[PDB]
């Protein structure tokens, strides 16, 4: 079986859906401590925003998400019809028929990544000041990838630091964080390597997109062996978007050029699972240095 | 609207009524409220934390679909072949509608934090004497757009849940109807208790004639006990009730009541919320 499976009893209860779990108090306390630790490394002048698990469908469309991962997107739908119509749908359900045929899309999707909503927000403020803007964002995200592996969820929490400004601003930020992220994983007693990577772009063209992204080194990941050293798990990523979002949303840097952006993302559930996989379910037995930095 | 002005310090627009980004000020208060509620948690209470989505089939069995079908948010996705999905996005490129290729997932956005806990308890067999107590939280969803700050589409719910005999649930209800009030009192909130059976603690937010329900008690009879086959220690279908706290409503209440400057909040309140 999967090396992570034995962890399930202590960390999760089933909710009748693969990748969707109830968190025990033990698991939760570790997520919160990881969150606090990440917060303690926040750079000065970084604005903290917290987003709900949903976001505007129009914004997600405009962001170009359907062009990259249409297969992962969770859209919100409801019964928007007339009372007669809605009653009809319910009656089918009562009669073992299919109520869902009356669903129609809402103006909302479940967020695929924590940073998305922040770009329209930064743009509404007009031109960027010299040195750009830094944001601290989090959200419960959704990706439509059902799986029984504990490191592959459908609903998971994502925490990010986001840099918006000049190519220089973003590169400095990304470099800084690739170093600081490795220092953090060390403090946590986790084994890792950092490597160039690519997003799981969809379809045939998606294979050309990934090769290109990898060669341009626009995405690094911090990888931790969970089920094996041969196929480690990405628990953080460092993403350079170049000018995509700046152009998309009309954000201009202090030079009046289309702003560049990048983000450093922490997979909270993946990090928590890595911690338990590495140090086990008995917190009293965790290494003293680890217990100390987490303030246990 | 009395609350509208609060937005300046609490929220940023996300392109959708009732869906706002939350500032550090606002979130710090939501967290402290969460902490305060935790401090009143009863012994022997199992704390579970639910994600924003849950089983569609569980939701169907809960009866929610019969009661508030218009408020449900169902999860839908593109579940077809690669060619079908590409076409959908191409239609979108050509000024058409890509959503016609959507089909329901096995999931919905949770309408109430406690719903998923009932099948969990049922799965463990007969309840012990005295029943079970749970502490649940979830980001919940209600498909009802509004510009009012106390009527969101996505909001945090916190709940203590009692599963047991009618005696268990009644003692639990009585206890919590009292604690809920004591809590609102310590928060320096002005409220009245009404019986909409269901108990509700309503706080004047827009007006005194139309106060907002910020905490409630729901008694479900043996509805979930019967649906999931939860059996009490005497072999009968279990009863359930829950005390529910609208975390985002409570936070808006606090800012409305005491203002957006935490330094000028009363010392009692700063004290109980670990601010002073
Ligand atoms: C007036 C009519 C449209 C509905 O009235 P209402 O605003 O729902 O008033 P209610 O008495 O139903 O409020 C209670 C419900 O509001 C919901 N709620 C809580 N916080 C909310 C918020 N921030 N935004 C929208 N709804 C919220 C909860 O689901 C709650 O249900 P519960 O008390 O059984 O747990
Ligand atoms: N299915 C899943 N289950 C659990 N965690 C996941 C996940 N998908 C992503 N994550 C976590 O979120 C992080 C960010 O994912 P990503 O790099 O694919 O998205 C982004 O581009 C963030 N802007 C990953 O490094 C991982 O730690
Ligand atoms: Zn990001
Ligand atoms: Zn409930």
Curated annotation (Swiss-Prot), chain B:
<dbReference type="GO" id="GO:0006418">
    <property type="term" value="P:tRNA aminoacylation for protein translation"/>
</dbReference>
<dbReference type="InterPro" id="IPR045864">
    <property type="entry name" value="aa-tRNA-synth_II/BPL/LPL"/>
</dbReference>
<feature type="binding site">
    <location>
        <position position="144"/>
    </location>
    <ligand>
        <name>ATP</name>
    </ligand>
</feature>
<feature type="binding site">
    <location>
        <position position="159"/>
    </location>
    <ligand>
        <name>Zn(2+)</name>
    </ligand>
</feature>
<feature type="binding site">
    <location>
        <position position="198"/>
    </location>
    <ligand>
        <name>ATP</name>
    </ligand>
</feature>
<feature type="binding site">
    <location>
        <begin position="213"/>
        <end position="216"/>
    </location>
    <ligand>
        <name>ATP</name>
    </ligand>
</feature>
<dbReference type="GO" id="GO:0046872">
    <property type="term" value="F:metal ion binding"/>
</dbReference>
<dbReference type="InterPro" id="IPR002314">
    <property type="entry name" value="aa-tRNA-synt_IIb"/>
</dbReference>
<comment type="function">
    <text>Catalyzes the ATP-dependent activation of L-glycine and its transfer to the phosphopantetheine prosthetic group covalently attached to the vicinal carrier protein bsr0959 of yet unknown function. May participate in nonribosomal peptide synthesis or related processes. L-alanine is a poor substrate whereas L-serine or D-amino acids are not substrates for ATP-dependent activation. Does not display tRNA aminoacylation activity.</text>
</comment>
<feature type="binding site">
    <location>
        <position position="159"/>
    </location>
    <ligand>
        <name>an L-alpha-amino acid</name>
    </ligand>
</feature>
<feature type="binding site">
    <location>
        <position position="242"/>
    </location>
    <ligand>
        <name>Zn(2+)</name>
    </ligand>
</feature>
<comment type="similarity">
    <text>Belongs to the class-II aminoacyl-tRNA synthetase family. Amino acid--[acyl-carrier-protein] ligase subfamily.</text>
</comment>
<feature type="binding site">
    <location>
        <position position="142"/>
    </location>
    <ligand>
        <name>ATP</name>
    </ligand>
</feature>
<keyword id="KW-0547">Nucleotide-binding</keyword>
<dbReference type="GO" id="GO:0004812">
    <property type="term" value="F:aminoacyl-tRNA ligase activity"/>
</dbReference>
<dbReference type="Pfam" id="PF00587">
    <property type="entry name" value="tRNA-synt_2b"/>
</dbReference>
<keyword id="KW-0479">Metal-binding</keyword>
<feature type="binding site">
    <location>
        <begin position="151"/>
        <end position="152"/>
    </location>
    <ligand>
        <name>ATP</name>
    </ligand>
</feature>
<feature type="binding site">
    <location>
        <position position="114"/>
    </location>
    <ligand>
        <name>Zn(2+)</name>
    </ligand>
</feature>
<keyword id="KW-0862">Zinc</keyword>
<keyword id="KW-0436">Ligase</keyword>
<keyword id="KW-0067">ATP-binding</keyword>
<protein>
    <recommendedName>
        <fullName>Amino acid--[acyl-carrier-protein] ligase 1</fullName>
        <ecNumber>6.2.1.n2</ecNumber>
    </recommendedName>
</protein>
<feature type="binding site">
    <location>
        <position position="249"/>
    </location>
    <ligand>
        <name>ATP</name>
    </ligand>
</feature>
<comment type="subunit">
    <text>Homodimer.</text>
</comment>
<dbReference type="GO" id="GO:0005524">
    <property type="term" value="F:ATP binding"/>
</dbReference>
């Amino acid at each position: 079986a999967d090396p992570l499976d034995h962890l399930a009893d202590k960390l999760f209860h089933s909710m009748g859906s693969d990748g969707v779990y109830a968190r025990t108090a033990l698991y939760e306390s570790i997520v919160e401590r990881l969150a606090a630790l990440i917060t303690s490394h926040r750079e000065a002048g970084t604005e903290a925003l917290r987003f709900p698990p949903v976001m505007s469908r129009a914004q997600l469309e405009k962001s170009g998400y359907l062009k990259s991962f249409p297969n992962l997107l969770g859209c919100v739908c409801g019964l928007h019809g007339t009372e007669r119509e809605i009653n009809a749908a319910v009656s089918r359900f009562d009669a073992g028929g299919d109520w869902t045929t009356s669903l129609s899309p809402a103006d909302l999707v479940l967020s695929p990544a924590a940073c998305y909503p922040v770009y329209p927000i930064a743009a509404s403020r007009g031109p960027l000041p010299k040195g750009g803007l830094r944001f601290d964002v989090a959200a419960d995200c959704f990706r439509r990838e059902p799986s029984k592996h504990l490191d592959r969820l459908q609903s998971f929490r994502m925490r990010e630091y986001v840099c918006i400004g000049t190519p220089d601003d973003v590169s400095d930020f990304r470099e800084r964080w690739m170093v600081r992220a490795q220092a953090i994983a060390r403090d946590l007693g986790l084994t890792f390597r950092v490597d160039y990577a690519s997003d799981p772009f969809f379809g045939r063209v998606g294979q050309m997109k990934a090769v290109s992204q990898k060669q341009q080194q626009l995405k690094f990941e911090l990888l931790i062996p969970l089920r094996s050293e041969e196929q480690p798990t990405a628990c953080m990523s460092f993403n350079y978007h170049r000018e995509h979002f700046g152009t998309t949303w009309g954000i201009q840097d202090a030079n009046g050029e289309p702003a560049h952006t990048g983000c450093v993302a922490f997979g909270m559930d993946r990090l928590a699972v890595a911690m338990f996989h590495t140090h086990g379910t008995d917190l009293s037995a965790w290494p003293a240095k680890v217990r100390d930095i987490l303030g246990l």
